[PDB]
């Protein structure tokens, strides 16, 4: 249990998180990584 | 001190109290 | 009087072991005895 | 005497290559594998990995989150979410970066979402040590 | 001269041993119906608290020795805070009544167990399992140590409050004499700093010796 | 002929110390360390504890009894 | 002179209790930190505990009986 | 003066049961600890637990019959 | 013969505090170790560690006092 | 007188076994925690402990035939 | 005679310094396993090492100022 | 008479060198753990288990010092 | 006089000695449980200990030869 536990953040969450922080490190050359990402692409439709 | 041969009426003033009073005291209780 | 009838199921029922105080009556005259004997002797 | 395999959603670095040991800056604490460890199963951390070849140069990655798995025989699996190098990376920007997220602590207001910026900070200031 | 209180048996014309020993029971009125006043309600709760965690263990035949252990250790504790005031008597000093209290109920589990599950009773000396081939070495290990529980059951209580009563009043002799030479509050300091762990150290002596009992009468249910 | 022999039996005596320092040391000691591996259950643990200190305690005070003792 | 050796001898024999701290100390350390590690085994953890408090107490209060008896 | 360099040989050396203590706390909480990992394997942990605590045990009878003989 | 009897005495009874020597050491190992796992924390561990560091210090200052007692 | 001296040197020298009970408890501990970790090990695991077993009671030993050497 | 039953208190008081050798033996054995299990956090592991080694030294000094003032 | 105090003021101040000998397992029995988890840092982990060994037996010579002024 | 005196601290002298064996357990005990892991590297840890039993006996043997001395 860390502090990230306990505090309503799931371990893929938090992978979420320090991918896309690492992610920004990167150099404005090979920042076309982002393209490759691109993880929003699916929309959620609920039952009612 | 402590050991001076007058153990009978302390052993017999326990028991009674023990064994009688907080007994019948403790039964008058609800949960 | 009027307490023993309050638990006599207790008395008659459980503590049937637990009234073997007969032990520590013979260990405490024991140890009186030899006290007195003690003392006796001076 | 290892067959390992440093694998990414995206490239492959190592596909059942022999190394003598490998480092690892997993969760609880670091690790050290070598011959026949152990069997034990732990997530990462942000931090840096190094693999010591058989000639004996070592060869450098960072990750950022996956598993680790070290099995009965010498056969580990290191499958990691995020695997770059140094090389295409901005030590300014990260500096940037870990500054604003300083000021964001105080910014923030409830816990949950100040842990997720402590998350940001913690990852800011992991990567700007090397 | 400091062994003046143990070694006084409630001096008098008439020894009033047995006055002082009834009183603290002047202090748990008996309810009388469905509402009542605040004095009684933190009475029954607390009994009710320490029920539950206790005798939470024994299968049926230990639920009947409740009130036994209840009325014990409301007892104990009781006799035990009563005695911090400054010029109190307390009974548990005394080894008379400790030596009559540990031998009955110890006495009772252990005749107990034989009455009823006498092959199994006899079992426990030897430990289960294989102990390798050392077996006679340790038979005769264990049923020595069965009988000085009693003897260390009373013993601690015995001694553990003395200790703490002689210490007290020692360091109130220390800070009463230094105030002639120079000046130190250091002495009063860790007098009353000391208090706060004398205060609460009978509870837990009176826990401990409820609880190896509760243990002890498990083995054999 | 009695006074100095006395005085040095309690003064031997007093050692028996130094066996509660090191447990109530070495419990304490693992409570930190088990706190640390989980903040839930707090209370528990520190009752854990408290009950060991307290039972070192006990086993260890008895020591100055006998110096008492043989002192008057 | 006879009974200032019984005192001496007396005062000096109960200093071997120390080990009774420190093995008491040491048994309750490792309950805390086990039960951190898996709050599933209670009871059969407070079982070996208590028999371990059990069985250490024993050395010390035996020599405590040592001195006592030679004492008197 | 015999009686009296019995009676402090003897008080001296009654002083070696204390490592016997300290071992069998040592023991029993290793096995505490060794429960939590593998419960199946709780069968073959007790042999080891009970050799040590017997050889523990037997070194302090050891030291307590060589202080008796020299009471006597 | 009198003050210099006691003066042994009086000295023999120091080496009480030498057990309050281990139980600060032994606390302190523990709080670099226990945090170093979890670099959060801080200010409940240093807490319980000054808890245990006074504790013990105070359980030597038991034998010190007696110590000083016994000169007077 | 030599009696005296005898006694005195023989008691003392006798109190030098706590280190090897010691020593055993903390051998035997060792073996249990490290065969619970990884299984399948037994042998160099074992053969750890009896070396130092040996050790520790060798070392005893030596004080033994010291004890025994005063004595006569 | 006053001068015979000096310099045993002062041999006896500097048994003391056994403590602090055993923690100061331990303190800095907890900060290498803590440093190996997280290279990251030292200065701050350096600085709590230095301040108990500090804290248990400057406690085992008590016993040679003791024996120290005595002897003198 | 005084050469009986020098001697056996001599002998007990002797006793002091236990705490060190004790103390050195810990700091190189401490590498040993700490390297097999991480072997890479090997070099780091020995400057502070020589620190400690150094430490421990500077304060165990301390004791030597004091015993060899006391004999002459 | 003189010879008793001489016997008596002699006798004390080899106290001390109690601290290697208690050390040696906790050596050999390390090994165990680091050969537990990484088992391969197994001569590097072999080599450490061997040096820490080394020093400890030779800490030991320093402690002994004042007994020789003394008496001789």
Same mark, same amino acid.
């Given at each position: 249990?860390?502090?990230?536990?306990?505090?309503?953040?799931?371990?893929?969450?938090?992978?979420?998180?320090?991918?896309?922080?690492?992610?920004?490190?990167?150099?404005?050359?090979?920042?076309?990584?982002?393209?490759?990402?691109?993880?929003?692409?699916?929309?959620?439709?609920?039952?009612? | 001190?402590?050991?001076?041969?007058?153990?009978?009426?302390?052993?017999?003033?326990?028991?009674?109290?023990?064994?009688?009073?907080?007994?019948?005291?403790?039964?008058?209780?609800?949960? | 009087?009027?307490?023993?009838?309050?638990?006599?199921?207790?008395?008659?029922?459980?503590?049937?072991?637990?009234?073997?105080?007969?032990?520590?009556?013979?260990?405490?005259?024991?140890?009186?005895?030899?006290?007195?004997?003690?003392?006796?002797?001076? | 005497?290892?067959?390992? $395999?440093?694998?990414?959603?995206?490239?492959?670095?190592?596909?059942?290559?022999?190394?003598?040991?490998?480092?690892?800056?997993?969760?609880?604490?670091?690790?050290?594998?070598?011959?026949?460890?152990?069997?034990?199963?732990?997530?990462?951390?942000?931090?840096?990995?190094?693999?010591?070849?058989?000639?004996?140069? $070592?060869?450098?990655?960072?990750?950022?989150?996956?598993?680790? $798995?070290?099995?009965?025989?010498?056969?580990?699996?290191?499958?990691?979410?995020?695997?770059?190098?140094?090389?295409?990376?901005?030590?300014?920007?990260?500096?940037?970066?870990?500054?604003?997220?300083?000021?964001?602590?105080?910014?923030?207001?409830?816990?949950?979402?100040?842990?997720?910026?402590?998350?940001?900070?913690?990852?800011?200031?992991?990567?700007?040590?090397? | 001269?400091?062994?003046?209180?143990?070694?006084?048996?409630?001096?008098?014309?008439?020894?009033?041993?047995?006055?002082?020993?009834?009183?603290?029971?002047?202090?748990?009125?008996?309810?009388?119906?469905?509402?009542?006043?605040?004095?009684?309600?933190?009475?029954?709760?607390?009994?009710?608290?320490?029920?539950?965690?206790?005798?939470?263990?024994?299968?049926?035949?230990?639920?009947?020795?409740?009130?036994?252990?209840?009325?014990?250790?409301?007892?104990?504790?009781?006799?035990?805070?009563?005695?911090?005031?400054?010029?109190?008597?307390?009974?548990?000093?005394?080894?008379?009544?400790?030596?009559?209290?540990?031998?009955?109920?110890?006495?009772?589990?252990?005749?107990?167990?034989?009455?009823?599950?006498?092959?199994?009773?006899?079992?426990?000396?030897?430990?289960?399992?294989?102990?390798?081939?050392?077996?006679?070495?340790?038979?005769?290990?264990?049923?020595?140590?069965?009988?000085?529980?009693?003897?260390?059951?009373?013993?601690?209580?015995?001694?553990?409050?003395?200790?703490?009563?002689?210490?007290?009043?020692?360091?109130?002799?220390?800070?009463?004499?230094?105030?002639?030479?120079?000046?130190?509050?250091?002495?009063?300091?860790?007098?009353?700093?000391?208090?706060?762990?004398?205060?609460?150290?009978?509870?837990?002596?009176?826990?401990?010796?409820?609880?190896?009992?509760?243990?002890?009468?498990?083995?054999?249910? | 002929?009695?006074?100095?022999?006395?005085?040095?039996?309690?003064?031997?005596?007093?050692?028996?110390?130094?066996?509660?320092?090191?447990?109530?040391?070495?419990?304490?000691?693992?409570?930190?360390?088990?706190?640390?591996?989980?903040?839930?259950?707090?209370?528990?643990?520190?009752?854990?504890?408290?009950?060991?200190?307290?039972?070192?305690?006990?086993?260890?005070?008895?020591?100055?009894?006998?110096?008492?003792?043989?002192?008057?």
């Amino acid at each position: 249990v860390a502090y990230w536990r306990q505090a309503g953040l799931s371990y893929i969450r938090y992978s979420q998180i320090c991918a896309k922080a690492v992610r920004d490190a990167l150099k404005a050359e090979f920042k076309a990584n982002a393209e490759k990402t691109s993880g929003s692409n699916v929309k959620i439709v609920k039952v009612k | 001190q402590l050991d001076t041969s007058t153990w009978f009426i302390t052993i017999t003033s326990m028991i009674m109290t023990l064994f009688i009073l907080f007994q019948l005291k403790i039964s008058n209780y609800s949960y | 009087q009027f307490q023993f009838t309050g638990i006599k199921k207790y008395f008659n029922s459980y503590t049937l072991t637990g009234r073997m105080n007969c032990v520590l009556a013979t260990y405490g005259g024991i140890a009186l005895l030899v006290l007195y004997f003690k003392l006796r002797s001076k | 005497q290892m067959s390992f $395999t440093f694998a990414s959603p995206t490239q492959v670095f190592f596909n059942g290559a022999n190394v003598r040991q490998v480092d690892v800056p997993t969760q609880t604490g670091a690790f050290g594998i070598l011959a026949s460890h152990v069997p034990t199963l732990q997530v990462l951390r942000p931090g840096l990995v190094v693999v010591h070849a058989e000639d004996g140069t $070592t060869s450098k990655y960072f990750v950022s989150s996956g598993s680790v $798995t070290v099995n009965a025989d010498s056969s580990v699996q290191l499958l990691a979410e995020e695997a770059v190098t140094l090389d295409m990376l901005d030590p300014g920007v990260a500096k940037a970066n870990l500054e604003k997220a300083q000021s964001e602590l105080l910014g923030a207001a409830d816990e949950a979402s100040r842990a997720e910026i402590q998350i940001r900070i913690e990852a800011n200031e992991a990567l700007v040590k090397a | 001269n400091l062994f003046a209180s143990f070694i006084a048996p409630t001096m008098m014309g008439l020894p009033i041993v047995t006055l002082i020993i009834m009183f603290p029971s002047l202090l748990f009125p008996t309810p009388k119906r469905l509402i009542n006043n605040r004095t009684i309600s933190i009475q029954q709760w607390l009994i009710q608290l320490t029920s539950k965690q206790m005798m939470a263990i024994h299968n049926q035949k230990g639920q009947t020795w409740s009130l036994m252990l209840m009325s014990l250790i409301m007892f104990i504790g009781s006799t035990n805070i009563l005695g911090l005031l400054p010029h109190s008597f307390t009974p548990t000093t005394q080894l008379s009544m400790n030596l009559g209290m540990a031998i009955p109920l110890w006495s009772a589990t252990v005749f107990t167990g034989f009455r009823y599950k006498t092959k199994t009773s006899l079992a426990h000396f030897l430990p289960q399992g294989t102990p390798a081939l050392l077996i006679p070495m340790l038979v005769i290990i264990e049923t020595i140590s069965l009988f000085i529980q009693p003897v260390a059951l009373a013993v601690r209580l015995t001694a553990n409050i003395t200790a703490g009563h002689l210490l007290i009043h020692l360091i109130g002799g220390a800070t009463l004499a230094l105030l002639n030479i120079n000046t130190m509050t250091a002495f009063i300091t860790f007098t009353i700093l000391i208090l706060l762990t004398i205060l609460e150290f009978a509870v837990a002596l009176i826990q401990a010796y409820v609880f190896t009992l509760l243990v002890s009468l498990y083995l054999h249910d | 002929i009695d006074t100095a022999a006395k005085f040095i039996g309690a003064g031997a005596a007093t050692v028996g110390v130094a066996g509660s320092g090191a447990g109530i040391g070495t419990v304490f000691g693992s409570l930190i360390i088990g706190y640390a591996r989980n903040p839930s259950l707090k209370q528990q643990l520190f009752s854990y504890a408290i009950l060991g200190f307290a039972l070192s305690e006990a086993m260890g005070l008895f020591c100055l009894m006998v110096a008492f003792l043989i002192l008057f």
